[model samples]
Target: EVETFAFQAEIAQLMSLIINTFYSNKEIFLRELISNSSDALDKIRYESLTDPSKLDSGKELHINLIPNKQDRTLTIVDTGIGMTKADLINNLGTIAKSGTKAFMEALQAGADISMIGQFGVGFYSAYLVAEKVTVITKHNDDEQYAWESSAGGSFTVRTDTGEPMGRGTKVILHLKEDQTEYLEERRIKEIVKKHSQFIGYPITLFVEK
Candidate 1:
């Protein structure tokens, strides 16, 4: 079933704010994504230590950057702790909550960022260079789901029926005309080294034979 959702109350305003906030350093969007993927990988690894079965995807933790130049898109796939239906809504929609809260606190003036928790603002940074963002994920415990949205708008979480992608999440970024540099293999490699060189897991840019 295709279920859609509105941007909570604060997300609309926050969207424009973030775009303006990161307008100049657009490449950092890729850095934010890599950081996010590495976080997910770490989560899965930590959990598997106890449950063991948590490593259902086979224990090889990695991030794949698949670029489609013709389509002007870059897909970041991570074999991490895939989210369920509830996760898509909460983790994403919280931008309407957590994001606004963090931005609000930053405005209210305080070094106390302890409550902001995992700032969802980083995900919205995708808006810096892409016109659209797509997330397809399958948790070991739940069915596959896809979330898609454009900046300054609502988002949808529909059931994904594509071939089994094993257990992971895929983030597809539909780049804007001017942001074509993000789709370049060379540019991607450079960004990774510059900002995410210290990540523990493998971050491979897909190279077709």
Candidate 2:
């Protein structure tokens, strides 16, 4: 089993606010997640050229989104080299050691930090619009897992009990009442192409009742 260092309480409080309110544009959440997906796709592409089938052949390196109006759920999916259970904890839950601590120290010392998105702080953006979020991911090296959270200190990670897709990740956002604009197919598509066209993969949006 792998273990990681815990964040000081001060760091946690600061990180929470930075995540909840830093970005004025809610759409940037798509950018951050897609950017992550692009990086994963890049990893798979490099691996595939070496072994032709090192990556999952059944799953393409693309991003797909589905918006459900009835339940106010926006699901963003990607067929890329996905994360394992450990990764979900490490990447999504923790703060960067050097950067986070340094930033905290700087703030305590009255230093200016006009720079955002520095070090390990991206996934927190998910909480801005989601009442709750569920992530279903499958890595080639491990079994599929589901990680659930609501921006609370408590997040649960367990083996997935749902259908096992080939390989990739899906993030389902149950939107807040005011954030339902993300459910529109045209708006979501535009945002995808605008911020993620260069992601080097096809992004399909499925909107159904």
Candidate 3:
């Protein structure tokens, strides 16, 4: 049987609303992306140790922040299990997250606790800082693809034709005028430490002088 990939119009709208209206904190964007990368790294490491064939599967799993002052862009790259086109749509375009649903249900059910591993709508935080965002990702199961969007309207995906790189993901943010502070190394480092220092993963910062 062949599988299909698609996102419902309503769900897409819901995602846009959730991203634009609900999430007010922008710093959490990096944290979310980093957390996702760390989880992917852990999975690959576990699989490699038990399954030798999976060794050397994912290259280094460190996180990198490349801030380009010339173009006012900040690029974050990670070497880990990347996502396929279908995974990208399901993971970033729509919401079928059980944990997030349950977390919300718990809130409605009068539970007073907070949970971090709730929502799967983390990647969209790129829109908060960037007027334009681009992602290049290669998965073990599929060819590398580029996902680009300007937020709200629609996103485009196609096979990557340039740059011969291995499995991993790179997110480039064309920083808006207001979010220009993110381009500063000191500010970026401070934000990372505040939200993700204890995340048990190697994170690094880079700047183009």
Candidate 4:
């Protein structure tokens, strides 16, 4: 079943602040995303050790970056544990009841100085540069689905009738007119090197000649 959800009242306000007021560094959006992807991969790998076969075991675990200038898109894909419908709702829609307060506390205490996903608001940082974002994901226990938003305080989640991705998540960012820098190979590589080189997984950049 496809569904659309409005961000919680507090979440909407925070998103506005995050996109327009904070996050002075836009390039860190890619870093935060890569870190989150690494965390997802780590979770699945840990879980797989106990079950051995909750899902496909053949897919190579890696992150892929595909930049399309003609279409003005940047796609980040990861062979990691994907999210279920409920997860998409909680993670992408509502900021936990206590989440907002905790986030605030972290900022006040300067506890979020290093970690990007510490307060779980890192995902929204994509809006710093992109006008719209779409996420296609497949979890072993759930059907393949997609979640999309324009960072306008609402989002939609729907069943993806397209080809199965086997397992993992794919996030596509529709770059804003002035954010075309993200679509350039040299820039992407520089960002990856500067911020993501420490990531444990392989992050391959797909560039066009």
Evaluated with lDDT, which candidate comes out highest? 4
What would the TM-score be for candidate 4 when compared with the true structure? 0.88
Model 2 lDDT tens row, 1-209: 22233444544565476555445577777777777677777887777788777564454678888889888998888888878777877754444545566666775686433332444444545666788888898888888888776654556678887889788889899899988988987788888878777767887778676
Between candidates 2 and 3, the lDDT winner: 2
TM-score of each: 0.88, 0.80, 0.79, 0.88
- Point to the candidate with the largest TM-score: 4
**Residue-pair clash count for candidate 2:** 0
The residue pairs that clash in candidate 3, if any, are none
Model-by-model lDDT, in order? 0.79, 0.71, 0.70, 0.80
Q: Could you tell me the lDDT of residue 113 within candidate 1?
A: 23
Model 3 per-residue lDDT at 150: 66
Mark the 10 consecutive residues where model 4 has the least summed lDDT. Answer: 110-119
Each candidate: RMSD: 3.4, 4.2, 4.4, 2.4
Write the residue-wise lDDT of candidate 4 on 1-209 in tens digits: 77988877776765676666645568878987888789888888888889878546444779999989888999899989989888888854454545666776776777542343677767767777788989999889888899998867888999998878988899899998988998888999999999888888899999776
- For every model shown, the clashing-pair count is 0, 0, 0, 0
Candidate 2: Cα lDDT at 62: 83
